[PDB]
Curated annotation (Swiss-Prot), chain A:
Function (record text): One of the primary rRNA binding proteins, it binds directly to 16S rRNA where it helps nucleate assembly of the platform of the 30S subunit central domain. The combined cluster of proteins S8, S12 and S17 appears to hold together the shoulder and platform of the 30S subunit.
Keyword rRNA-binding: yes
GO annotation terms (biological process): translation
Record-level GO cellular component terms: ribonucleoprotein complex; ribosome
Gene3D superfamilies tied to this protein: 3.30.1370.30, 3.30.1490.10
Family designation: Belongs to the universal ribosomal protein uS8 family.
Organism: Thermus thermophilus (strain ATCC 27634 / DSM 579 / HB8)
Name of the protein: Small ribosomal subunit protein uS8
NCBIfam families linked to this entry: PRK00136.1 (NF001109)
One of the Pfam families matching this protein, by short name: Ribosomal_S8
Subunit structure: Part of the 30S ribosomal subunit. Contacts proteins S2, S5 and S12.
Lineage of the organism: Bacteria, Thermotogati, Deinococcota, Deinococci, Thermales
GO molecular function: rRNA binding; structural constituent of ribosome
SUPFAM superfamilies in the cross-refs: Ribosomal protein S8
UniProtKB/Swiss-Prot annotation, chain B:
One Gene Ontology cellular component annotation held by this UniProt entry: small ribosomal subunit
HAMAP family: Ribosomal_bS20 (MF_00500)
Keywords for this protein: Ribonucleoprotein, Ribosomal protein, RNA-binding, rRNA-binding
Chain segments carrying region Disordered: 1-26
Role played: Binds directly to 16S ribosomal RNA.
Assigned protein family: Belongs to the bacterial ribosomal protein bS20 family.
GO biological process: translation
SUPFAM superfamilies noted in UniProt: Ribosomal protein S20 (SSF46992)
GO molecular function terms attached to this record: small ribosomal subunit rRNA binding; structural constituent of ribosome
Organism expressing this protein natively: Thermus thermophilus (strain ATCC BAA-163 / DSM 7039 / HB27)
Cited InterPro entries: Ribosomal_bS20 (IPR002583), Ribosomal_bS20_sf (IPR036510)
Keyword hit for rRNA-binding: yes
Bias type Basic residues, positions: 1-25
Protein name (database record): Small ribosomal subunit protein bS20
Curated annotation (Swiss-Prot), chain C:
Stored PROSITE patterns: RIBOSOMAL_S4, S4
UniProt keyword annotations, A-Z: Metal-binding, Ribonucleoprotein, Ribosomal protein, RNA-binding, rRNA-binding, Zinc
Protein name, UniProt field: Small ribosomal subunit protein uS4
Subunit structure: Part of the 30S ribosomal subunit. Contacts protein S5. The interaction surface between S4 and S5 is involved in control of translational fidelity.
Manner of cofactor binding, per the entry note: Binds 1 zinc ion per subunit. In a number of structures (e.g. 4Y4O, 5FDV) a 4Fe-4S cluster is seen in place of the zinc cofactor.
Keyword rRNA-binding attached: yes
Record GO terms (molecular function): metal ion binding; rRNA binding; structural constituent of ribosome
UniProt xrefs under InterPro entries: Ribosomal_uS4 (IPR022801), Ribosomal_uS4_bac-type (IPR005709), Ribosomal_uS4_CS (IPR018079), Ribosomal_uS4_N (IPR001912), S4_RNA-bd (IPR002942), S4_RNA-bd_sf (IPR036986)
Binding site for Zn(2+): C8, C11, C25, C30
Biological processes annotated in GO: ribosomal small subunit biogenesis; translation
Cofactors named for this entry: Zn(2+); [4Fe-4S] cluster
Swiss-Prot record, chain E:
Assigned keywords, A-Z: Methylation, Ribonucleoprotein, Ribosomal protein, RNA-binding, rRNA-binding, tRNA-binding
Bias kind Basic residues: ranges: 108-119
Protein species of origin: Thermus thermophilus (strain ATCC 27634 / DSM 579 / HB8)
GO MF annotation terms: rRNA binding; structural constituent of ribosome; tRNA binding
Pfam families, alphabetized: Ribosom_S12_S23 (PF00164)
Record protein name field: Small ribosomal subunit protein uS12
Gene that encodes it: rpsL
Residue(s) carrying 3-methylthioaspartic acid: D88
SUPFAM superfamilies given in the database record: Nucleic acid-binding proteins
Amino acid sequence: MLTDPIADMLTRIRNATRVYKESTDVPASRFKEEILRILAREGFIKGYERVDVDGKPYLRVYLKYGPRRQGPDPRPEQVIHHIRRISKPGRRVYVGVKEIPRVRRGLGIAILSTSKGVLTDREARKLGVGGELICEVW
Amino acid sequence: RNLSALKRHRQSLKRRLRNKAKKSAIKTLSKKAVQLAQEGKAEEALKIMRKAESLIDKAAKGSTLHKNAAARRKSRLMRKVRQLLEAAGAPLIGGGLSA
Amino acid sequence: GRYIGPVCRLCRREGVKLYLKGERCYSPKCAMERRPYPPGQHGQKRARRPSDYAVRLREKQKLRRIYGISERQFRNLFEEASKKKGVTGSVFLGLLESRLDNVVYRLGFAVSRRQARQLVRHGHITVNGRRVDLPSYRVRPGDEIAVAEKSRNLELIRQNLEAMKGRKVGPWLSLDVEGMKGKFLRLPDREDLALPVNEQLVIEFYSR
Amino acid sequence: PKKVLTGVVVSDKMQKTVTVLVERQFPHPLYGKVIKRSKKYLAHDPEEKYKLGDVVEIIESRPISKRKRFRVLRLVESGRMDLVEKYLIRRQNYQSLSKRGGKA
Amino acid sequence: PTINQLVRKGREKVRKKSKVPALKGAPFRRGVCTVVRTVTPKKPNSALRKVAKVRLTSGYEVTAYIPGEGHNLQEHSVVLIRGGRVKDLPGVRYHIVRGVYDAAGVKDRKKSRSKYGTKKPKEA
Amino acid sequence: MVKIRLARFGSKHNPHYRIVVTDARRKRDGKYIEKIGYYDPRKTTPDWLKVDVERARYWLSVGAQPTDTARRLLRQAGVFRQE
RNA sequence: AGCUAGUUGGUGGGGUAAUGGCCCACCAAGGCGACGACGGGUAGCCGGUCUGAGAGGAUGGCCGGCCACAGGGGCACUGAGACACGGGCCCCACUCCUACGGGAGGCAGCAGUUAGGAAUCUUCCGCAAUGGGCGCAAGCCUGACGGAGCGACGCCGCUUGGAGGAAGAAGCCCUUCGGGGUGUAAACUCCUGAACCCGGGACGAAACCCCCGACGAGGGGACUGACGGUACCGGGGUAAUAGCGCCGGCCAACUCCGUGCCAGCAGCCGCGGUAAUACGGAGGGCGCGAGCGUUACCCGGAUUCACUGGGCGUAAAGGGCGUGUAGGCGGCCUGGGGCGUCCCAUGUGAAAGACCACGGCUCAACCGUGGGGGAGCGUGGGAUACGCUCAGGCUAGACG
RNA sequence: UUGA
RNA sequence: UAAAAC
Ligand SMILES: [K+]
Ligand SMILES: [K+]
Ligand SMILES: [K+]
Ligand SMILES: [K+]
Ligand SMILES: [K+]
Ligand SMILES: [K+]
Ligand SMILES: [K+]
Ligand SMILES: [K+]
Ligand SMILES: [K+]
Ligand SMILES: [K+]
Ligand SMILES: [K+]
Ligand SMILES: [K+]
Ligand SMILES: [K+]
Ligand SMILES: [K+]
Ligand SMILES: [K+]
Ligand SMILES: [K+]
Ligand SMILES: [K+]
Ligand SMILES: [K+]
Ligand SMILES: [K+]
Ligand SMILES: [K+]
Ligand SMILES: [K+]
Ligand SMILES: [K+]
Ligand SMILES: [K+]
Ligand SMILES: [Mg+2]
Ligand SMILES: [Mg+2]
Ligand SMILES: [Mg+2]
Ligand SMILES: [Mg+2]
Ligand SMILES: [Mg+2]
Ligand SMILES: [Mg+2]
Ligand SMILES: [Mg+2]
Ligand SMILES: [Mg+2]
Ligand SMILES: [Mg+2]
Ligand SMILES: [Mg+2]
Ligand SMILES: [Mg+2]
Ligand SMILES: [Mg+2]
Ligand SMILES: [Mg+2]
Ligand SMILES: [Mg+2]
Ligand SMILES: [Mg+2]
Ligand SMILES: [Mg+2]
Ligand SMILES: [Mg+2]
Ligand SMILES: [Mg+2]
Ligand SMILES: [Mg+2]
Ligand SMILES: [Mg+2]
Ligand SMILES: [Mg+2]
Ligand SMILES: [Mg+2]
Ligand SMILES: [Mg+2]
Ligand SMILES: [Mg+2]
Ligand SMILES: [Mg+2]
Ligand SMILES: [Mg+2]
Ligand SMILES: [Mg+2]
Ligand SMILES: [Mg+2]
Ligand SMILES: [Mg+2]
Ligand SMILES: [Mg+2]
Ligand SMILES: [Mg+2]
Ligand SMILES: [Mg+2]
Ligand SMILES: [Mg+2]
Ligand SMILES: [Mg+2]
Ligand SMILES: [Mg+2]
Ligand SMILES: [Mg+2]
Ligand SMILES: [Mg+2]
Ligand SMILES: [Mg+2]
Ligand SMILES: [Mg+2]
Ligand SMILES: [Mg+2]
Ligand SMILES: [Mg+2]
Ligand SMILES: [Mg+2]
Ligand SMILES: [Mg+2]
Ligand SMILES: [Mg+2]
Ligand SMILES: [Mg+2]
Ligand SMILES: [Mg+2]
Ligand SMILES: [Mg+2]
Ligand SMILES: [Mg+2]
Ligand SMILES: [Mg+2]
Ligand SMILES: [Mg+2]
Ligand SMILES: [Mg+2]
Ligand SMILES: [Mg+2]
Ligand SMILES: [Mg+2]
Ligand SMILES: [Mg+2]
Ligand SMILES: [Mg+2]
Ligand SMILES: [Mg+2]
Ligand SMILES: [Mg+2]
Ligand SMILES: [Mg+2]
Ligand SMILES: [Mg+2]
Ligand SMILES: [Mg+2]
Ligand SMILES: [Mg+2]
Ligand SMILES: [Zn+2]
């Protein structure tokens, strides 16, 4: 058993991209799927899709990267130079709308889970609501 | 030395005595009444009970008891009295107690 | 209060020309002209590479010494400038520049700042017709700075205000050489002033 | 408004008085983690109406005694010693914490 | 530590021990001299540093350095202690205030005078 | 009894009072119940005396007793004019 | 690390303005504690204050709010109110009177004395102003207060001069002995004119009161200033206090002589044993300036107790291992609830302070006015993603 | 032996 | 060799 599926996911991703994988499977849950959408729309990953491995539901997550590069070490840049978990079991982090942070002066996002669904710090700010600060990506 | 308002003391001692005396009477009569009732002697148990009521209310006219202090006493009195009587019966003189 | 001592030695230390004397500072009789090198028994030896600190110091010393203001008053002004909205550097200068003892100097009633200071003290100056003998008094926009009538006929105010005929006056100021009165038009913009000083360094000195 | 609290009756060895265990949750002031603290209230029960295991509402009342400043508003949920258990046990572990002896 | 841990034990605040039990943390303490010895420097020094055992008002007895070229402190000299150790003589953690009470200022001192209690010499 | 009086707030030689409603027993510069005006005895500005007439009238309506000086100022501001 | 007998609860009383083991009979045998009881130590709490980028740390003097105390202990009387600082009773310690039986007293009110201490003021003026008590009022009382006095203790403003002056006096200091420095600094020339001397001279004070009117609204009139002959205005008018720390690195400022592990310096690293920019003096220089240094103490730098924001193979740090209690934490789907969480409205968040703005003292310090802030908590309404809870389902964890 |  | 010491 995973103690925190959401962190598990952000990591599977963190790890998959650090070795330039093409996709990466993660056990499914609506909530996880919901975050992937934000992740897609913001253009961090190419997208994802429901699949079945060994007969159990997963979520292929097609990752994205920059272009090849010059000089020593041609490995591309990462679209996801960062992806950390904020709230964690046994230390949840909740914020008010005036308390939603601004990741990298806006060049990054923060996915919150509010009583109006899962949204980015901009979306959440817009609808004028706060919630559980899930993670920040940039 | 000599703060002429020693007069306040001088007076408190009088008022003290004046009160102490009014209450001493209230108590004695209250008992007398409670005792008479406790023996079924309704006729006079109330007779005396009324003096007590009257004495109490008068004491409340000035600083002696004044207030709900009186109320409390009249209450606890008629309460004890009516009861000790209704343990033999016959509320004769029907002094202070109603119906 | 105020320095009160050899002022040319200050020019020589900052290596730049400061005008703590008005005339003479223009004449080749100036000390910055004769021996343009630090005062003292070592002013002529090779100056060692100054430390980042020395630089910020010397720079700020320069600016402050230009107005003859005390490190005390000089600092309080800077802290006031910091708090206010707007580029601290600019605001600071506008403030140092709004000092009556200085405005009187800008309007040529005096040849130097140290002189304009004494003019203010000895009541020879006026603000909106009311007397003011506070060198630190802060002139606001619209205020009119004049000369006490009782003073208008002074052997000194003659030359100074006379020699002011046909002379230009800073963009933020207007001078009426006849009525012996000028007007503080607006707070000097950083670019209006041309001081041999880099405020960034100053802002950074008080940063430390 | 008179404060109202909800808890479990963890004792009723007292005449017309039951011990209600109320819990609360709050963000630790510096560390944020939601922590759960709890307190026991001696509520007034004039009819010996409530029993061990009863979850009830307690309401700020006028003093009934030193210590008693609450009355049982109403029964929220009948029997459930699962809660009473935690308590008894947590208190039972106290034995094994001195210089004497108890249980593991 | 985990958060649960910090929630349970929390961090412990750093306490600070004094270098000057001049008691009441008082800036200065008055005392009377016992001895007026001399001491040997340690580590890599050599000289006859002038110390003084002092019985303070604060019910204390401690050694205190006598700064300056030379003093006039006998046995029962009334002195003022000010605190400031002396890297060389372990045990000496205070200084006598030249210029206060029985300890006379320093003579012929023309520079760092406020320290060493020396009035300004007239000149003309 | 409650009162409508002056509370000194200026500074040395620079007195500025506050017309206040405070309990009679309180120190003067102490905790008042309500400010209902102010007064600059040296009338150093065009506005050296303001009074919330509606409010003053309210307190007077419930017992508040003005100082003889506060009564004077309250009058000057038309608290008692009934034309 | 266990605590508890009025102890926890009950019935009936007593008591108070009033609830209540507050107190008393009688009855039950309870109550409290690792979510830290009991004990020990220390301490009046708060608005705020200092510091910090913040989070936080430290703090509670002045001012405002609450509490407690009035030589120490206890008690009640009087009264709307007290268990009463300048009221009462008793015990105690002390001081004073004593014809020895016995009495008198309590500055943690203002001022002052003495003691202790490194250290903290005038036995001042006034009741004019504000406020308070009593009085129908005149008025009386008010060491509350408004003022002055002393102390650079702090903050702010101000002066010890301004302009001209030698390819540059003398003196003093270095020197390649040519000269370099102090330095336009000085003397000088001219100008202004703090101090001081005359003249004028204040706001703060219009009420209470009297008259008219109705003892009201309204109107009219009179008295009253401690600060003070002070502030300030005008006239005249002298060129007239500068000190303190530092100059080896950190750290801005360097040379000669003296001294020779000595005398001494020293915040840390360190410096002095013959040529020391580090000891002492001198010339020169840097910093700051009616102050400048020192000591002590708080925060900072210190992400060095790390929530923001740290670590544990060899640096300090994994428990010798297991079993397991409490606690902490919890896979996937659906539904109810709506505690956590989030949202709107509302109440509260005093004044002062802090922030912004305008304004009053010539400025400022200081002060007045106005505006904007605000976490937390109460109330009403709403949201339901996540956490929690209840109910049902699943098989990917676990177990068989 | 000390110190550098 | 400056000293401690011989
Ligand atoms: K009487
Ligand atoms: K003009
Ligand atoms: K036990
Ligand atoms: K009324
Ligand atoms: K009872
Ligand atoms: K304790
Ligand atoms: K602050
Ligand atoms: K923070
Ligand atoms: K605190
Ligand atoms: K505190
Ligand atoms: K605090
Ligand atoms: K009238
Ligand atoms: K004059
Ligand atoms: K002169
Ligand atoms: K020599
Ligand atoms: K040497
Ligand atoms: K030297
Ligand atoms: K030296
Ligand atoms: K520190
Ligand atoms: K070990
Ligand atoms: K062990
Ligand atoms: K609220
Ligand atoms: K739900
Ligand atoms: Mg009798
Ligand atoms: Mg009465
Ligand atoms: Mg003149
Ligand atoms: Mg029971
Ligand atoms: Mg509770
Ligand atoms: Mg040595
Ligand atoms: Mg020290
Ligand atoms: Mg009126
Ligand atoms: Mg027991
Ligand atoms: Mg009862
Ligand atoms: Mg009762
Ligand atoms: Mg009890
Ligand atoms: Mg304790
Ligand atoms: Mg204490
Ligand atoms: Mg910090
Ligand atoms: Mg700050
Ligand atoms: Mg803070
Ligand atoms: Mg206070
Ligand atoms: Mg005493
Ligand atoms: Mg009474
Ligand atoms: Mg009394
Ligand atoms: Mg007294
Ligand atoms: Mg003494
Ligand atoms: Mg008076
Ligand atoms: Mg009065
Ligand atoms: Mg000379
Ligand atoms: Mg000159
Ligand atoms: Mg003249
Ligand atoms: Mg009068
Ligand atoms: Mg008449
Ligand atoms: Mg009449
Ligand atoms: Mg009138
Ligand atoms: Mg240097
Ligand atoms: Mg020699
Ligand atoms: Mg020697
Ligand atoms: Mg030195
Ligand atoms: Mg030498
Ligand atoms: Mg040096
Ligand atoms: Mg040095
Ligand atoms: Mg810093
Ligand atoms: Mg820290
Ligand atoms: Mg570490
Ligand atoms: Mg080892
Ligand atoms: Mg190790
Ligand atoms: Mg091991
Ligand atoms: Mg468990
Ligand atoms: Mg779950
Ligand atoms: Mg759980
Ligand atoms: Mg659903
Ligand atoms: Mg649910
Ligand atoms: Mg809720
Ligand atoms: Mg609110
Ligand atoms: Mg406020
Ligand atoms: Mg102004
Ligand atoms: Mg305000
Ligand atoms: Mg808010
Ligand atoms: Mg609400
Ligand atoms: Mg609500
Ligand atoms: Mg719902
Ligand atoms: Mg289930
Ligand atoms: Mg098994
Ligand atoms: Zn020049």
